[PDB]
Amino acid sequence: TIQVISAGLPRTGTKSLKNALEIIYHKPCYHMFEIIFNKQSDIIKWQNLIHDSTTKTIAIYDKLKELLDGYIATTDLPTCGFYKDLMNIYPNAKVLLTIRDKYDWLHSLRKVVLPKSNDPWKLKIEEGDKVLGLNSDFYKLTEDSLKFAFQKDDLNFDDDQVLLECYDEYNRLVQETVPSDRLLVLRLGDGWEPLCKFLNVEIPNGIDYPCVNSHHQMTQLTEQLIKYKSLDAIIHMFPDL
Ligand SMILES: OCc1ccc(NC[C@@]2(Cc3cccc(C(F)(F)F)c3)CCN(Cc3c[nH]c4ccccc34)C2)cc1N(O)O
Numbered sequence: 576t577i578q579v580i581s582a583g584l585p586r587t588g589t590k591s592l593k594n595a596l597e598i599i600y601h602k603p604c605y606h607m608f609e610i611i612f613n614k615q616s617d618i619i620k621w622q623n624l625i626h627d628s629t630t631k632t633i634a635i636y637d638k639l640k641e642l643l644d645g646y647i648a649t650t651d652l653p654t655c656g657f658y659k660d661l662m663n664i665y666p667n668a669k670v671l672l673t674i675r676d677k678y679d680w681l682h683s684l685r686k687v688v689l690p691k692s693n694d695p696w697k698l699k700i701e702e703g704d705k706v707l708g709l710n711s712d713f714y715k716l717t718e719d720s721l722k723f724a725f726q727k728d729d730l731n732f733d734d735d736q737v738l739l740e741c742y743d744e745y746n747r748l749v750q751e752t753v754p755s756d757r758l759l760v761l762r763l764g765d766g767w768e769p770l771c772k773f774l775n776v777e778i779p780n781g782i783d784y785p786c787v788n789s790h791h792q793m794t795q796l797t798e799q800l801i802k803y804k805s806l807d808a809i810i811h812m813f814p815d816l
């Protein structure tokens with residue numbers, strides 16, 4: 576069952592955290608990679624779960640628990656905006672918030688997750704997405720999960736100023752909302768020490784804190800997917816996946 580709730584937004588180090596939690600607990604962690612490289616069936620389940628935000632709350636909470644059964648932690652979209660509900664469902668779970676410089680975050684988001692509608696790189700991302708078998712339902716899940724995390728009904732995804740404001744507002748509100756001894760804010764570069772002390776575990780012996788999922792590596796993955804049109808053919812070059 577869930578031991579750690581991760582509230583950090585995509586492109587803040589969530590895959591490195593997922594890897595780190597799996598090293599610490601020796602059990603699997605949710606992350607969107609789980610959805611795309613393992614379980615594309617859960618897309619609609621998240622999308623429908625998102626529209627839901629008393630017998631309404633019990634129905635939502637049971638569907639969250641079923642989606643997360645078998646995992647010890649959640650990172651990344653679409654679980655982000657549910658961090659408060661997860662605190663209620665799992666009262667002993669600790670909460671992590673991965674953060675970084677807002678401009679670095681926005682660039683990383685634009686290059687990997689949510690390119691502008693007139694960015695030429697969007698064309699490549701979409702071509703690689705088809706090689707992975709991702710359809711418009713996945714795109715709507717990404718957009719709706721971000722809107723849900725930001726608590727916005729209407730969001731112009733092409734507006735960087737609004738995304739930067741939403742980023743700062745989201746990170747501030749997590750730090751206001753999570754009881755303070757229940758929260759650890761992790762900045763990129765912090766390493767094992769703050770995470771292991773917060774979780775009260777020993778630092779893993781002789782291994783660096785994970786450094787995975789860079790935009791440089793995602794750009795290479797997209798380029799290789801577009802070139803050969805086969806994930807099986809290229810997976811050997813991307814051992815993290
Ligand atoms: O939770 C991490 C996360 C969750 C979901 C997604 N979906 C983003 C993508 C789809 C998309 C959505 C909206 C607009 C567009 C656009 F604009 F291109 F049309 C594309 C763009 C790239 N595609 C492959 C992929 C990259 N990473 C992934 C992680 C997991 C699963 C797949 C991917 C998915 C990305 C990430 N990140 O952070 O990578």
Ligand SMILES: Nc1ncnc2c1ncn2[C@@H]1O[C@H](COP(=O)(O)O)[C@@H](OP(=O)(O)O)[C@H]1O
Nearest residue numbers: 586587588589590591683785786787788789790
């Ligand atoms: N240990 C680490 N040190 C520095 N940056 C790290 C890191 N682990 C992950 N990152 C950065 O976190 C981002 C990935 O976050 P996520 O896994 O949530 O999608 C990437 O930013 P860049 O796109 O700027 O390279 C990646 O380089």
